Design a protein around this nucleic acid. Structure first.
Lengths: 79, 98, 55, 98, 87, 55
DNA sequence: CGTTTTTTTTTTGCATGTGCCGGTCTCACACGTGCCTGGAGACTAGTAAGCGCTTCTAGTGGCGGTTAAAACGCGGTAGACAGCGCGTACGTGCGTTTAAGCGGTGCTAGAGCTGTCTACGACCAATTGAGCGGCCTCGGCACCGGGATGCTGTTTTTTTTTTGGGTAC
DNA sequence: CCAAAAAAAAAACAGCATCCCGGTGCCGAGGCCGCTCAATTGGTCGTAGACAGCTCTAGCACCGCTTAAACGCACGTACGCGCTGTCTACCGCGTTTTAACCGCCACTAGAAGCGCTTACTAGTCTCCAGGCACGTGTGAGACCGGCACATGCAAAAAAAAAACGAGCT
C-alpha cells in the first residue's frame, strides 16, 4: 500500500546517478519489487538483532550488522 | 517557442545528480515503507531516525549501483533505453536471483 | 591526504563524505580495498558512457 | 560422405560434458602452469598432488560458471556466439573486473 | 640451492579443445576465436591470485611444500570455498 | 536423503560427489546455502539454453 | 552533362552553470573543563613455542610405450552484422495538484544504567570408553563388447502461399 | 479452374552414435580389532548475567504554513525493432602429429613428530592522566544575488556528393 511512496520521479533520479539516459516505463514497476526484496532481506535480519537484544526500538547498530551480514557494510552510523 | 531534444535534459539531470550527495528518495514515503514491511516480522516496533536514514543510504546506494550494471547490460544489447530484462540479467550475474 | 586534497580542489577547508568517496575510488587500490563498502552521503564519480554522449 | 550441420555436434558435446564431472584440462600442462606461476612468488616450491588437484578443481569450475554467465550476455546481445565482450561484461558486473 | 627446472611458458598448454570443453559444460554452443586467448588471460589472473594467497599461507607455516590445505584457506579467503580437500 | 535419492535415481548403491551436487543444486534452499562453495568432481546440472536448440 | 537534392558545415540566436565579485546568518566544528576508568607499572607464574634431533612420508624425476588428444587444412553452412524503413514509446515542458518539509510542542514508551544476588560454567582431578589408526575381505562399479533404439540429414511427397490468365457476378 | 513456383513441408529411407545389457576384474568400501587419549563424572570456586529499580533520552503525534515536488497531459522525435541481403567466421570431419598418461623405477627433500629449555605474556593489584561527556564560541559554509562569460544546443542558411533526365553506339 505504501510501496509506491517510492515515486516514478524518485526512481528516475536514482537511475540518473546510476548513469541512465532513457528508461522503459516497465522499469519503475521492476525497481519497486527489487527495492522491496532488498529492504525485506536487510530489515528481517536487522530486527533479528533487535529481538535478540530484546528491544522494541530498532537501532542504527541493528541495520549496520544486518547490511554487513548481507555483504553491504555501511560506514557512517556507529561502525 | 523553445524545446530541448528527447535526451539532452536527461543528460543534464545525470551530470547534475552524480555531482551531488543528497538522498534522491523523499524521506517520509520511505520511512513509512520502512515501517510497513517491518510490521510483517514483528508488530509494535520503533526506529531510530538514524536507522531509517541507515536504510535509505544503503537502499539508494544499492539501486544506484544496480542501475549502473543494468545500464551496462542494456548498452551491451545495442541499446540506451534500459529495460526489465537488463535488471533481470544484472542480478542473475550478480548472484542475487537464479 | 587524498580527501584533504579534494577539499582544496573544491576550495573547501573541511573534508566531507564526498571528499573521501572521491579520494577512495580515484586510488585503484583503496577502491579495491573498500570494494564491498558503502560510504554514507558519498554519491558516485562523474561518469557517462560514450554511446550516451553526442556525436 | 556423412555430414552434420554446424551446431549439431556442439549440442551433443554440451549434453555429453554437462552430464559428466571429470576434469577437462590435461593435468600435466596444468601442473607445469601451476608450478610456472608458483615460481613468480617464490621459486623451488613443492606441491602436494591434492594441492594441484585442489587448484585444478577450483579453476575448471570457476570458468564453467564464467561460461554460463558469459553465454547469457551473448544471448542478451541477441547472439548465440560468445565473445570477448561477454567475458569482459560478466567479469565487470561480477566486480572481478574494475 | 638450485636444481633441474627454471620456469617455461605452459600458457599455450591450454589446448583450444580444452577451453572448448569448459564452455560446452558452461552451456556454450558457439565460440569466437578471440575467446581462447581471452580465457588464457583470466585463468592466469585467477591462479596468480589464489596461489599468491596459498604461497602466503605456506610462508606463514614456514614450509617449502604447498599443501592441499594452503590452497583451501586462500580459495575460501577469495570467497570461492571448495569441498573435497579437507578444512 | 536427496543425495541418496539421486544415487538410487542413477542406479548406484554409493553416493558420489556428482550426487551431492545433483541434490544440492536442485533444492532451492541448499543451493542458496552453498552459493559461494565448490563441490569437487560435481560438474554442473544439464542446462542448455532454449535459444540454442534446433530451429 | 549541369538538373533536382540530402546534408554537412557556418553563423545565429539562446539558455544554463559556472563562477566571482559583492552581501547576511546560523549552527556545527572546535576547543575548554572536570572527573572517572582504562592503560601504566612492577612482580609472579606457567606454558607456548623456539630449537635441536629424529622419523620416514611423499614429492621428484626419469624411462618407454601405447594411443588417446593436439594439430592443421578444406569447404560450406549459417550466423554475425550492417543497412534501412516503419512504428510509437518515451522525453520535454508548462500547467495543475499534492503533500513533504520545517519548526514547533506535547507525551511517555522504552532505552539504558545501577546494585544485588545466585545459578552456571570454568577449572581441576581421576576414569574409562569413544573414536582413532591399522588391517583385510568381497561386492559395487569400472570396463568392454554387442544390440536395440533414438535421432539427424539426406533424399523424395505433397502442399501450401506470391502470382497468374480465364469466368461469370 | 488449374496453373504455377517456390517454399515449405512430410516422411521415407539410411546412417550414426549413445544407452543399456551381461560378462569380467579389482580395489576401495566397509568392518572388525585393539589401544590411546579425549570425553565424562564429581567437586570446588568465582563471577556473568539476570532482575528490579530508576532515570530521562528520544521516538511518536500532531499541526499549520510555505513551497518544492508530483502529477498530468500534449505533442513529435528519436530509438526500439523487425526484416533482408551479404559475407566469412566458425563447426564439422578427416588425416597428420604430438606427448599425455600409464606403471614403475629409485632418490631424498622436508613434513612432522619428539623432548627440552626459557623467554615470553597472562594475571594481579596499585596508581593517574589520557580520553570521555559536557558545555560554550564563532567562522565556515549555506545561501543569494546578480552580472559575465564560457559551454554547449537548437536552430536556419550555404557549399558539396546523389538522383535525373536525354542521347550516341
Amino acid at each position: 500500500d505504501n510501496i509506491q511512496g517510492i515515486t516514478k520521479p524518485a526512481i528516475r533520479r536514482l537511475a540518473r546517478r546510476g548513469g541512465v539516459k532513457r528508461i522503459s516505463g516497465l522499469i519503475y514497476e521492476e525497481t519497486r519489487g527489487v527495492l522491496k526484496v532488498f529492504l525485506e532481506n536487510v530489515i528481517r535480519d536487522a530486527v533479528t538483532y533487535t529481538e535478540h537484544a530484546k528491544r522494541k526500538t530498532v537501532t542504527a547498530m541493528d541495520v549496520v550488522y544486518a547490511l554487513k551480514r548481507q555483504g553491504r557494510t555501511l560506514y557512517g552510523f556507529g561502525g | 517557442p523553445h524545446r530541448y531534444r528527447p535526451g539532452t535534459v536527461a543528460l543534464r539531470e545525470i551530470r547534475r545528480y552524480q555531482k551531488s550527495t543528497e538522498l534522491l528518495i523523499r524521506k517520509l514515503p520511505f520511512q513509512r515503507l520502512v515501517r510497513e514491511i517491518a510490521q510483517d516480522f514483528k508488530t509494535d516496533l520503533r526506529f531510530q531516525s538514524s536507522a531509517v536514514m541507515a536504510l535509505q543510504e544503503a537502499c539508494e546506494a544499492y539501486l544506484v549501483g544496480l542501475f549502473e550494471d543494468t545500464n551496462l547490460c542494456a548498452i551491451h544489447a545495442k541499446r540506451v533505453t534500459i529495460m526489465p530484462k537488463d535488471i533481470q540479467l544484472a542480478r542473475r550475474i550478480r548472484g542475487e536471483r537464479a | 591526504e587524498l580527501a584533504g586534497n579534494a577539499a582544496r580542489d573544491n576550495k573547501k577547508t573541511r573534508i566531507i563524505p564526498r571528499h573521501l568517496q572521491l579520494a577512495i575510488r580515484n586510488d585503484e587500490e583503496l577502491n579495491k580495498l573498500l570494494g564491498r563498502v558503502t560510504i554514507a552521503q558519498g554519491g558516485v564519480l562523474p561518469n557517462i558512457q560514450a554511446v550516451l554522449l553526442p556525436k
